[PDB]
Amino acid sequence: DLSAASHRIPLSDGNSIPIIGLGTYSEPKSTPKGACATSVKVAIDTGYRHIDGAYIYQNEHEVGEAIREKIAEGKVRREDIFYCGKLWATNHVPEMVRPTLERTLRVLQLDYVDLYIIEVPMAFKPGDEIYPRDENGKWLYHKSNLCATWEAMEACKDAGLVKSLGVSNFNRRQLELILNKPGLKHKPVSNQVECHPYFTQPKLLKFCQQHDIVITAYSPLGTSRNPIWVNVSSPPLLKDALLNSLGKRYNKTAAQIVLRFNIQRGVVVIPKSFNLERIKENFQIFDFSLTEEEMKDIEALNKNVRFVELLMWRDHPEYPFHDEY
Ligand SMILES: NC(=O)c1ccc[n+]([C@@H]2O[C@H](COP(=O)([O-])OP(=O)(O)OC[C@H]3O[C@@H](n4cnc5c(N)ncnc54)[C@H](OP(=O)(O)O)[C@@H]3O)[C@@H](O)[C@H]2O)c1
């Protein structure tokens, strides 16, 4: 059903989202300028029609530069491109939601984004710094009011600034808080969370599917394993015995195996790569399919261990990882 030329899956609001997209986060200090723009351009030439980014990644202007150039030359129309932006923790005050989205539209130099999501359920001290802390290093938190923040996101869709609304790093409770909100206008159509063979999100996936919420697997390849924030407790996902074994069977890499695993179960994948060859490799997942037995053996690889714990904020009231899901 899913092909390189056509792999968009339905969202509950009547829109659709390409099942594979290009992630664009890259460590600022160790990433050449223009690398994100080049990659987005290569991704689009390869066949990607979905790009995942965020203002705090500090390269949203490069993302816009690439999309606009590809539109300019006629490689794609704006409508063929799906861009997802994110609302960071220091911008959850209702009055700041729209101005924050507008800044991103100005950075991208686009009239709207296809998907705008609350980046994390935790609210931080409003200001310039994206990581608020006093002289003692104590993180400056802000009282979260997801319901209020959501109503402001809704107003943004009403103004035509965004086609779909969603969330990221939200547990069942935080999702319910919105899904049961009195007078809910636009339900979240997506929840972007860590998801791969080592963290399959079995219960959260069921919950979301139950409410017609599509899951977007971030860090679908198990992260770049940067110790600054990545829990390296688990061995490299792409070095996994079974994943590499199955790869040989289909003459595919473990990366292609894990990506295929998620899209075959209806989970959107947004693998990040700024490497010409790997960008292409990750897209070649429509010419084969895993058997029901292999799908089961891969799912059986789950360890219930996150590569992204965000432990520095485990004391925040809205930390999403205490609950079982
Ligand atoms: N919303 C959130 O809270 C959140 C959190 C984390 C990530 N995300 C989003 O999800 C995207 C994906 O996640 P992520 O960047 O953390 O991780 P990832 O996509 O799981 O892995 C990326 C790492 O894998 C390498 N890689 C890419 N393709 C590869 C292949 N075929 N074989 C071997 N290595 C490969 C990349 O290096 P090269 O670039 O050199 O190929 C990079 O070091 C982000 O970039 C971002 O758009 C969202």
Q: Which residue type does 60 have?
A: E
As given in the structure block, the two tokens for residue 57 are 């990644």
Answer positive or negative: Cα dihedral of 198, 201, 203, 206.
negative
Ligand 1: which of 24, 31, 118, 219 to mutate, judged by most atoms within 8 Å of the beta carbon? 219
Largest distance between two CA atoms of the chain = 56
* DSSP secondary structure letters along 199-262: B--HHHHHHHHHTT-EEEEESTT-----TTT--TTSPPGGG-HHHHHHHHHHT--HHHHHHHHH
Alpha helices (runs of H) in the chain, residue ranges in sequence order: 35-46, 60-72, 94-108, 146-158, 172-179, 202-210, 241-250, 254-264, 276-283, 292-299
> How many Å apart are CA 269 and CA 21, to the nearest integer?
6
Q: Which residues of 171-189 are buried (b: 16+ CB within 10 A; e: fewer)?
A: bbebbebbeebeeeebbbb
- From the CB of 7, is ligand 1 less than 6 Å away? no
> How many Å apart are CA 35 and CA 147, to the nearest integer?
37
Q: What is the resolution of this structure in A?
A: 2.0
Are 199 and 219 within 8 A, CB to CB?
no
Are 89 and 131 within 8 A, CB to CB?
no
Q: 292 Cβ partners below 8 Å, 6+ apart?
A: none
Give pairs for 271-277: CB < 8 Å, separation 24+.
271/20, 271/22, 271/23, 271/220, 271/221, 272/22, 272/23, 272/24, 272/25, 272/26, 272/221, 272/224, 273/22, 273/23, 273/39, 274/26, 274/31, 274/35, 274/36, 274/38, 274/39, 275/39, 276/42
Backbone angles phi, psi at 162, to 5 degrees: -155, 140
How many angstroms does the Cα of residue 273 sit away from the middle of ligand 1?
Answer: 6
Check 55, 57, 83, 141 and give the catalytic one: 57
How many Cβ atoms from other residues are within 10 Å of residue 309's Cβ? Answer: 16
How many angstroms does the Cα of residue 222 sit away from the middle of ligand 1?
Answer: 7
Looking at residue 169, the DSSP 8-state letter turns out to be S
As given in the structure block, the two tokens for residue 279 are 């960008």
Is 160 labelled as part of a ligand binding site? no
- Kindly state which CATH superfamily the domain 1-325 is placed in: NADP-dependent oxidoreductase domain (3.20.20.100)
How many angstroms does the Cα of residue 137 sit away from the middle of ligand 1?
Answer: 29
Looking at residue 40, the DSSP 8-state letter turns out to be H
How long is the chain?
Answer: 325
What experiment produced this structure? Answer: X-ray
> How many Å apart are CA 265 and CA 269, to the nearest integer?
11
Known catalytic membership, residue 198 = no
∠ CA(267), CA(271), CA(273), 5° rounding? Answer: 170
Closest CA to 257 of 281, 235, 228, 233: 281
> How many Å apart are CA 262 and CA 216, to the nearest integer?
9
- From the CB of 313, is ligand 1 less than 6 Å away? no
How many Cβ atoms from other residues are within 10 Å of residue 220's Cβ? Answer: 28
Q: 260 Cβ partners below 8 Å, 6+ apart?
A: 252, 285, 288, 289, 290
> How many Å apart are CA 178 and CA 195, to the nearest integer?
22
∠ CA(131), CA(132), CA(136), 5° rounding? Answer: 115
